[PDB]
Design a protein around this nucleic acid. Structure first.
Ligand code: ATP
Ligand code: MG
Ligand code: MG
Length: 152
RNA sequence: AAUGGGUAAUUAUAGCGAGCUAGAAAGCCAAAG
């Protein structure tokens, strides 16, 4: 639905996607990772340079956090005698792994010629032109290892 | 002095030993629906 079409359509709950404005809808703020720099079928012909030097290919990356449930569930018990194995640490860890992959991934794909098809929980699936997809995951992890101090 | 004979050495030497351009394209399919 569009913005002003909320006057027209009858609903019960409205979900708003990748937004922080208050607005008049009093909606529910979901966070779906999404980006398109172009259509999917143009990413092969976008792999050229300004010279013409590039192979007409498109790359696809599927990222995955390693041992995510093993770091969610147990996670913190290594430091101390176990005095950091609480709900609020894992609830903050719950946000910080969703705040990364569902919001911050569009900043990493700001001007890259790609399309994040899905990013959620641990998993990313992002088609795109091959120079940028290779540059995406190098730029994603080098951010994600600074986000987590090298762990996860 | 005549006369009988040739004898030894070298058997190639110094280099280059490949260079550059192309390294899969276009259809089917998928897209556009
Ligand atoms: N957003 C999330 N936050 C915390 N845990 C998650 C999230 N999404 C999935 N999981 C966890 O991931 C587990 C499934 O394993 P998954 O492959 O998804 O990641 P993993 O546990 O790190 O394993 P792997 O190393 O194979 O990726 C589930 O037990 C679930 O609890
Ligand atoms: Mg996982
Ligand atoms: Mg997983």
């Amino acid at each position: 639905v569009a913005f002003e079409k909320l006057s027209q359509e009858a609903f019960s709950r409205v979900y708003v996607k990748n937004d922080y404005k208050a607005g008049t809808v009093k909606a529910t703020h979901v966070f779906v990772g999404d980006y398109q720099c172009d259509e999917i079928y143009n990413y092969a012909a976008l792999s050229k340079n300004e010279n013409g030097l590039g192979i007409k290919r498109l790359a696809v990356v599927r990222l995955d956090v390693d041992d995510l449930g093993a770091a969610f569930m147990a996670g913190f018990s290594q430091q101390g005698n176990g005095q950091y194995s609480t709900l609020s640490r894992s609830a903050t860890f719950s946000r910080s792994m969703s705040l990364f992959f569902k919001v911050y991934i569009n900043q990493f794909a700001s001007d890259k010629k790609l399309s994040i098809i899905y990013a959620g929980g641990d998993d990313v699936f992002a088609i795109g032109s091959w120079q940028d997809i290779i540059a995406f995951t190098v730029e994603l992890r080098e951010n994600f290892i600074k986000w987590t101090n090298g762990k996860l």
